[PDB]
Design an enzyme around this catalytic site. Structure first.
Site, PDB file in Angstrom:
ATOM      1  N   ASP A 138       0.840  -1.196   0.000  1.00 21.23           N
ATOM      2  CA  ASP A 138       0.000   0.000   0.000  1.00 21.23           C
ATOM      3  C   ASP A 138       0.872   1.241   0.000  1.00 21.23           C
ATOM      4  O   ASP A 138       0.543   2.249   0.620  1.00 21.23           O
ATOM      5  CB  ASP A 138      -0.930   0.001   1.216  1.00 21.23           C
ATOM      6  N   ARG A 142      -0.329   9.045   0.317  1.00 20.33           N
ATOM      7  CA  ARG A 142      -1.227   9.250   1.436  1.00 20.33           C
ATOM      8  C   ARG A 142      -0.797   8.434   2.649  1.00 20.33           C
ATOM      9  O   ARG A 142      -1.254   8.689   3.761  1.00 20.33           O
ATOM     10  CB  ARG A 142      -2.663   8.905   1.044  1.00 20.33           C
ATOM     11  N   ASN A 143       0.080   7.459   2.438  1.00 16.05           N
ATOM     12  CA  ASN A 143       0.574   6.630   3.537  1.00 16.05           C
ATOM     13  C   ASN A 143       2.002   6.977   3.933  1.00 16.05           C
ATOM     14  O   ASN A 143       2.647   6.250   4.686  1.00 16.05           O
ATOM     15  CB  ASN A 143       0.455   5.137   3.203  1.00 16.05           C
ATOM     16  N   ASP A 156       1.241   3.198   7.862  1.00 16.45           N
ATOM     17  CA  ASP A 156       0.082   2.389   7.490  1.00 16.45           C
ATOM     18  C   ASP A 156       0.449   0.988   7.019  1.00 16.45           C
ATOM     19  O   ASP A 156       0.546   0.719   5.821  1.00 16.45           O
ATOM     20  CB  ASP A 156      -0.746   3.084   6.415  1.00 16.45           C
TER      21      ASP A 156
HETATM   22  C1  LIG Z   1      -0.702   7.001   7.925  1.00 11.26           C
HETATM   23  C2  LIG Z   1      -1.340   7.886   8.975  1.00 11.26           C
HETATM   24  C3  LIG Z   1      -2.312   7.060   9.804  1.00 11.26           C
HETATM   25  C4  LIG Z   1      -2.694   7.713  11.124  1.00 11.26           C
HETATM   26  N1  LIG Z   1      -1.550   8.242  11.872  1.00 11.26           N
HETATM   27  C5  LIG Z   1      -0.607   7.742  12.731  1.00 11.26           C
HETATM   28  C6  LIG Z   1      -0.533   6.290  13.093  1.00 11.26           C
HETATM   29  C7  LIG Z   1      -0.813   5.851  14.386  1.00 11.26           C
HETATM   30  C8  LIG Z   1      -1.153   6.812  15.499  1.00 11.26           C
HETATM   31  C9  LIG Z   1      -0.768   4.496  14.692  1.00 11.26           C
HETATM   32  C10 LIG Z   1      -0.455   3.568  13.712  1.00 11.26           C
HETATM   33  C11 LIG Z   1      -0.190   4.009  12.424  1.00 11.26           C
HETATM   34  N2  LIG Z   1       0.131   3.366  11.289  1.00 11.26           N
HETATM   35  N3  LIG Z   1       0.295   4.296  10.248  1.00 11.26           N
HETATM   36  C12 LIG Z   1       0.078   5.545  10.724  1.00 11.26           C
HETATM   37  C13 LIG Z   1      -0.235   5.354  12.101  1.00 11.26           C
HETATM   38  C14 LIG Z   1       0.243   8.797  13.187  1.00 11.26           C
HETATM   39  N4  LIG Z   1      -0.295   9.908  12.551  1.00 11.26           N
HETATM   40  C15 LIG Z   1      -0.121  11.261  12.414  1.00 11.26           C
HETATM   41  C16 LIG Z   1       0.800  12.140  12.959  1.00 11.26           C
HETATM   42  O1  LIG Z   1       1.697  11.755  13.735  1.00 11.26           O
HETATM   43  N5  LIG Z   1       0.683  13.446  12.621  1.00 11.26           N
HETATM   44  C17 LIG Z   1      -0.288  13.878  11.766  1.00 11.26           C
HETATM   45  O2  LIG Z   1      -0.351  15.096  11.475  1.00 11.26           O
HETATM   46  N6  LIG Z   1      -1.184  13.026  11.234  1.00 11.26           N
HETATM   47  C18 LIG Z   1      -2.225  13.510  10.319  1.00 11.26           C
HETATM   48  C19 LIG Z   1      -1.107  11.731  11.552  1.00 11.26           C
HETATM   49  N7  LIG Z   1      -1.912  10.689  11.126  1.00 11.26           N
HETATM   50  C20 LIG Z   1      -1.341   9.600  11.797  1.00 11.26           C
END
Ligand SMILES: CCCCn1c(-c2c(C)ccc3[nH]ncc23)cn2c3c(=O)[nH]c(=O)n(C)c3nc12
Length: 275
Positions: A138, A142-143, A156
């Site tokens: 993936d 966006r990831n 992700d």
């Molecule tokens: C790929 C993003 C999925 C959601 N995710 C995670 C995250 C989390 C918290 C836990 C497991 C994860 N796997 N992949 C990402 C992820 C961390 N973050 C952030 C972030 O740190 N700052 C930001 O500004 N944004 C918008 C964030 N969005 C996320």
């Protein structure tokens, strides 16, 4: 799951904002106090109230995978909360969010070298991921998350597997009969490279899925983004070789970008689907 994910104490976590909504529950920002008393900003994914046992396994499944990587260009897992509710996954905080939405807000506002720095980080992280025996499956803008210093990090791991699907980012052979390898991730990387140089334009725009699959199979490729350095467009084409064995390895991609970062005078040659 606690094999690769340390259980955090909820008293060490402060939630300071709801920042988004994931596949499994809200996504927030806040702070985590470490055992050394140092406090860091963190992203906090919560598991929705009323979760089924299945959802819980899938939710924490991502953490077990993430917890296996320790690399500057892969999102760092700080830990999980499972012994109280809501169940949470805690990761480093990335101030500038998703790479594609970030770039869309800054169309043509970065230098070639800055974009290449971003791309080098992604490749380095993918190099490590593939070194560890995982296929992401993936890999898309966006990831990729980007921090306050423009450092990009792979995230992700929902679809990730040890060695539905986003058609636009998936290689021909993976689409055709689910042949996923590191070389299919390299294909995706090529698409990501296109996304970056296009500042977050959607791959193949709004073409029907059917036509994306057919056109690519017939040998058509996304065209050079506006003002794209020839060197970078050719790298896309190499990543999109029909024969997967002819694609560069992530290690070679890292090496190529490392050179481009050096002599930006390489980047001075500048370049509907192309056949
Ligand atoms: C790929 C993003 C999925 C959601 N995710 C995670 C995250 C989390 C918290 C836990 C497991 C994860 N796997 N992949 C990402 C992820 C961390 N973050 C952030 C972030 O740190 N700052 C930001 O500004 N944004 C918008 C964030 N969005 C996320």
């Amino acid at each position: 799951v606690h094999e690769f994910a340390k259980e955090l104490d909820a008293t060490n976590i402060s939630i300071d904002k709801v920042v988004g909504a994931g596949e499994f529950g809200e996504v927030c920002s806040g702070r985590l106090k470490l055992p050394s008393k140092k406090e860091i900003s963190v992203a906090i994914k919560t598991l929705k109230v009323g979760y089924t046992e299945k959802q819980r396994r899938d939710f924490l499944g991502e953490a077990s995978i993430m917890g296996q990587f320790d690399h500057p260009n892969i999102i760092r897992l700080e830990g999980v909360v499972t012994k109280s509710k809501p169940v949470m996954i805690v990761t480093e905080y990335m101030e500038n969010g998703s790479l594609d939405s970030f770039l869309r807000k800054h169309d043509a506002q970065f230098t070639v070298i800055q974009l290449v720095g971003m791309l080098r980080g992604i490749a380095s992280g993918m190099k490590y991921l593939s070194d560890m025996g995982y296929v992401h499956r993936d890999l898309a803008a966006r990831n990729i998350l980007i921090n306050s210093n423009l450092v990009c990090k792979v995230s992700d791991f929902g679809l990730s597997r040890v060695l539905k699907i986003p058609i636009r980012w998936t290689s021909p052979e993976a689409i055709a009969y689910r042949k996923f390898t590191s070389a299919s991730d390299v294909w995706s990387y090529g698409i990501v490279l296109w996304e970056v140089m296009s500042y977050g334009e959607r791959p193949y725009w709004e073409m029907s899925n059917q036509d994306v699959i057919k056109a690519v199979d017939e040998g058509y490729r996304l065209p050079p983004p506006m003002d794209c350095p020839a060197a970078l467009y050719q790298l896309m084409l190499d990543c999109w070789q029909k024969d997967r064995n002819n694609r560069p390895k992530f290690e070679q991609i890292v090496s190529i970008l490392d050179k481009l970062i050096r002599n930006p005078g390489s980047l001075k040659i500048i370049t509907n689907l192309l056949l």
